[PDB]
């Protein structure tokens, strides 16, 4: 799911050719605003991961009786930096970053049971008070019979860190996307960069046009169904009674 940054910039030359970002007026060659370009591309990738799933992750929490709030932050995760004031209870899963948890979706115990999320008055309900924290009531401990939990959630990749010495290559960086959403990301970046430039009648609408094309492309991807889509088929026949 990777692409060399080199190819991305070479293609974005073909749509940013009008403006400062990539061209000297004479002998059009890429400038050194590459930091700003990268900062825009990362935002584009995050937006695409918002619009389509494209990824999902997993953790594993080791419970502790009498605890009320379990935050999912990269200071409690094994292999991360062990801040002394916190006990590292997240013992397994994808490495956690600043933007990794877009939404928690499933919670599965060690017994194979499936608990309920934000479904009030359900038998064993788990509440998220702050979108990245699990609030576990005492009734859960009363009737839990489970020593660990498995969490699944919608992910977004962690962008690679650029560096002033890394300005040498900038071509070994790898964006994390399938190529389809590359074609879409081009329009996104072009719109964002071209918006605040131009004073002529036809040159003041390029940003708007690129936004329109971006939306059309997203709709086309949805229609072609090039993203993950689970579809549920319960049993309903093993409960005992529907047969």
């Amino acid at each position: 799911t990777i692409q060399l940054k080199q190819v991305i910039d070479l293609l974005a030359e073909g749509e940013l050719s009008n403006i400062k970002y990539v061209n000297i007026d004479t002998g059009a060659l890429v400038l050194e605003r590459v930091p700003s370009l990268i900062r825009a591309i990362n935002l584009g990738v995050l937006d695409l991961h918002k619009r389509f799933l494209l990824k999902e992750g997993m953790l594993k929490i080791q419970l502790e009786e009498g605890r009320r709030l379990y935050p999912l932050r990269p200071a409690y995760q094994v292999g991360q930096k062990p801040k002394p004031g916190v006990p590292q209870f997240i013992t397994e899963g994808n490495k956690l970053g600043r933007q990794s948890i877009l939404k928690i979706e499933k919670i599965i115990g060690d017994n194979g049971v499936e608990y309920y999320l934000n479904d009030t008055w359900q038998p064993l309900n788990i509440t998220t008070p702050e979108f990245d924290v699990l609030e576990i009531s005492d009734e859960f401990y009363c009737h839990s019979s489970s020593k660990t939990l498995e969490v699944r959630y919608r992910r977004a990749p962690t962008p690679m860190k650029i560096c002033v010495d890394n300005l040498d290559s900038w071509g070994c960086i790898d964006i994390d996307l399938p190529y389809t959403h590359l074609q879409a990301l081009l329009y996104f970046v072009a719109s964002r960069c071209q918006t605040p430039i131009g004073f002529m009648e036809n040159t003041a609408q390029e940003g708007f046009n690129f936004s329109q094309k971006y939306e059309a492309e997203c709709a086309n991807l949805d229609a072609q169904n090039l993203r993950i889509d689970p579809v549920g088929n319960q049993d309903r026949f093993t409960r005992g009674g529907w047969v």
Partner: protein
């Protein structure tokens, strides 16, 4: 010391002549040609500007 300025002096009919009109048109053509060689002009504004000028 009287050199008579003539129509030939203004412009001979050839495209590549040495008349003043001819050389002004040639320099305009060169500037437009470089502009088109860079990604800035289509092949139709090239004609429009010249005909207007």
């Amino acid at each position: 010391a009287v050199e008579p300025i003539t129509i030939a002096d203004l412009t001979e009919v050839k495209l590549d002549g040495k008349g003043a009109l001819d050389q002004l048109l040639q320099v305009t053509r060169l500037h437009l040609a470089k502009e088109h060689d860079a990604g800035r002009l289509k092949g139709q504004e090239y004609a429009a500007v010249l005909t207007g000028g």
